[PDB]
Design a protein around this nucleic acid. Sequence first.
RNA 1: GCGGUAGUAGCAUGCUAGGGAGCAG
RNA 2: UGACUGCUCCCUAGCAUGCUACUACCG
Lengths: 586, 187, 190, 103, 78
Amino acid sequence: AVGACVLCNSQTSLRCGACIRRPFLCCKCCYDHVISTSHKLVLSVNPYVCNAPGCDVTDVTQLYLGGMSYYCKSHKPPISFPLCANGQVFGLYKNTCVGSDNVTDFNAIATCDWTNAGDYILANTCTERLKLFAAETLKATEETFKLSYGIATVREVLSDRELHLSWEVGKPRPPLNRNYVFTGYRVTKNSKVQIGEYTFEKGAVVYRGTTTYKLNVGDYFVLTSHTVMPLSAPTLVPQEHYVRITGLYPTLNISDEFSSNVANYQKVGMQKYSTLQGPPGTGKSHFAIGLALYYPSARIVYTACSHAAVDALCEKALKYLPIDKCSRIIPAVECFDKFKVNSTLEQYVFCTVNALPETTADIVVFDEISMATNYDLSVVNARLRAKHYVYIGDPAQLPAPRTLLTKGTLEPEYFNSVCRLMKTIGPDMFLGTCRRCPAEIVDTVSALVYDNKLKAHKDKSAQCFKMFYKGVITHDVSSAINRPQIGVVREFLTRNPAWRKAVFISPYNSQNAVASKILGLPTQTVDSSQGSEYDYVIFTQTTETAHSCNVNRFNVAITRAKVGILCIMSDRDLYDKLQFTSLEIP
Amino acid sequence: FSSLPSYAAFATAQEAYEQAVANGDSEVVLKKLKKSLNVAKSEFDRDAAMQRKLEKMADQAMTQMYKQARSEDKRAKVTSAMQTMLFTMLRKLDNDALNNIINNARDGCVPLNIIPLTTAAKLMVVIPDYNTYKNTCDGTTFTYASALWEIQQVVDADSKIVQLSEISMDNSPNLAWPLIVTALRAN
Amino acid sequence: FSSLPSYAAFATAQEAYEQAVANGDSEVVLKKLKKSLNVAKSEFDRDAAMQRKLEKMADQAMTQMYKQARSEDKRAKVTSAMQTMLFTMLRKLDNDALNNIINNARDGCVPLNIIPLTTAAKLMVVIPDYNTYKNTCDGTTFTYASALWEIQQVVDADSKIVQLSEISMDNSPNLAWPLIVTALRANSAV
Amino acid sequence: NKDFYDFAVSKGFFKEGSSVELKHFFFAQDGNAAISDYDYYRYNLPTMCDIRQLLFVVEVVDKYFDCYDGGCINANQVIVNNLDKSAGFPFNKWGKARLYYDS
Amino acid sequence: SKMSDVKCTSVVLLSVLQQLRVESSSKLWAQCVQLHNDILLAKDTTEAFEKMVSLLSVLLSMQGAVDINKLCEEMLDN
RNA sequence: GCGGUAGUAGCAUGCUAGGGAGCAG
RNA sequence: UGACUGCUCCCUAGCAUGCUACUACCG
Ligand SMILES: [Zn+2]
Ligand SMILES: [Zn+2]
Ligand SMILES: [Zn+2]
């Protein structure tokens, strides 16, 4: 009941009747919320409505406070004083209220459909708590506009990986790839019954098996969502550098295999938070282990948004240093049970943004912070009250798709809370680790956005592929299948012997789904190639209008290779000075 | 109630009539002044009580809403409130047996069943480290809950019997430590 | 309260009388003003009171009729619920044994206490302790009420399955003892 | 209620040897209590009476109950207070006594 | 004053035990109820204390349940 | 000059209706 | 899951009666 309106710094019991999150607005604050826009309904400890039987008044501007109750205008016992009067709304804290100078914060960003770029613009032009309200409202609008599409179901079953699928009544269908997991429920007569986790991309309906299934009649698959609760801890911690190396457990040996570790070790010695801007091969592979060995007993927590990217470190986090000192817990969802699972007690707790309880910790070393709003930062800073932070990440690592984009692409810097801070105050560490990624990618990628931080560490043997091509497009309701650069990729792989050991990633899974029918290259998604980076690669774009060929949405997915790459680009923007070997079409 | 136009009109009429009467005058002027004064006086006097009733009623309504909100808040923290209260009273009791068992549970040595009161019946506890064994178990007797017990069995996490002579300072750290002592109440 | 039928006449008379007063005419016009305005306000008084009485009467009538309608709706739904309950419990009467024992009666009337005793398909036994257990339902089939029953399931006070192999004299003090035994009529009904 | 107990203790109450002490509490019962309490009807036995003496005792009792008046009343003269109480079995699955006195 | 204190503490302890879903085990709940009802009827202050130890042992022998150490660091039990 | 009548305001008295709580058999 | 009666205190709403007061009409 009693929450907090903070812009006016006013405890409140009121809330707007028709709004996004039942937001909390004080007396004068609810007033200029209900006169600057149209929100003529409020909720208190009890809702304001005439109490005579059969009466109906939604409005509050004409209700009266009667005999320990509320009465109204059309049906009027008016022995009272009006509820809305004298620049205020009747409630508790009617005296200890301040008001708002910026009248149109809610009136600007809580009044639109939460999809324009102006929402995020103002969210970055906010305070910590105001931008917390912003991030929670973005999660709320994500779920509330995801719960407006259909539910897939299999009513007569066919052979697995090739079924039939009817959907729903009149609703449209969302995008097509494995972004939306079709994990619904089955109904016997009134109850919900074990179903499993599914995903629909190819349709005759070809399914990808997150598990092996024996589908029965009627089985329904759809994401059923709850609402993210309000959070009680700030996302970012204010920048305060340490007086000394007091309270640390120093070691005697110094890392040697890593050539950019000692100065950054000292930095962690007197740095409180740490974020950098890097593609694969930026210390995310070895520097975490470097800190792990350089301070043994420090409570250091790691996390990636999916377990297959936590695995990229955890696979040898138990080999480089003893097993007894790491863990991450697996809920049951694709998660890897390598470590000591169902064990809160550990030292180097690996984690996933989706789930981890809170006991205690002291040092933060968290991986990518990309595909979520301030929820990711806040849940992990609430997870532990830490003395040191390392926010490994990038505003372009896996930039959060803004659901149904309608109005352009915003500046990459404007991420949750730290990426705009990031290159306005400078990178937190001196760190570049190009021991897998070669210089052929580094040249272009660092000349574009990551200036002078990553090194041209490894040379190339003039095998990088160029072929001038414009291309033609053909789109579907939720994806697109490519004629021309797909054919050119085919006839290119028919020229070189040792090129059929690559990946076939796709902007939407439809490309590899169609290709599996006649060649059969493995399925790959642009969603998250979690901790799985390989040298030889076949990249494809099909349709690239606003999600692909705009900014560094996947310029890290252009950092594919180690000694050789393929990166198909059907536009004429990201080639300005790229010098791939010029060879003619066959 | 001096913030209403009725008060202003009544005050001006009062002043005018009082000045005219104190100056001394005839009957018709007094009659006209009082006929123009009494209506304003009644106008003031009605609101003078209506405002008071409104103010007290508003105060009562705010009181009632505060009470409802506080009751709703209070009925949602009962588990934590009760646990804190119980441990406060347990502090205030100040008994040696209760203090002994509370400290033992706080360090890790908890029981496995209800503590018996008779001169018989079995009690099982868990001893997770050598220091607790050093403090409690010395010889073949057991001191727990301000009483005396006699050890008769020691079982490890692997459920193998360990003889009493085995446990020693350096001879212990090769064992499954969460031991389980089963004793009976000495007379 | 502002467009009453007498409001026009009252306001027009007041305006005309006060204009005549502002004209500074003789005392006769003032006396006429006073009389006319007094009678005008007197006639406006009942027109302002009776209407307010009537509105409150109408509002009370509306409220009473609304609550009557709500009561009727509730009655209809409770009637539907009772009918559904009766017709649902009808479907378990075992209409062959019941008919067989009804026809044997000399006029169609039988005591109610002997209907479950001779036509029920399931039997439930509650056992306090082991001494009572070994005298009532020992083994796998027992006899009660001149019929043969065979055990189907045994649970405890916590509603957890208990196997007959562990209901012994030694293991008795390890069970939540208010045991419930379920059996079926053998050779007869289920 | 800890606040009231502390207030009472801070005023010289509940001392040793006092003549005022607590002996009224809320007692708790285990699972098989309702049936154990119902089993007290075993004290009800069939009893035959001395009829020639009961037929005179009833006359004296009727003499005692003689200064009142009674009879039957219509359904619109019945007074019921607190219509928000239980209606019994199986009527408690659908509402209180208000539902059946209104329907 | 040392007897009413233990009776009030026993009432609070039984409430705390009931909040932890103990009555889902008939034997444990019956024993707890018997102990609690026996404490309130006591006349001397030694039997009440041993029964109090027995009743508190039920709460102490439940691992997850509550945090003994946090509830001892809040300027509470020593 | 006195009384009657019609509204309006404050105050007091007893019932009816609604809600919250206490004790007793 | 919450029975039947009896008594008492508190708060609000309506009705009836009485007291006083302010204007107006009538004789
Ligand atoms: Zn609003
Ligand atoms: Zn506000
Ligand atoms: Zn109304």
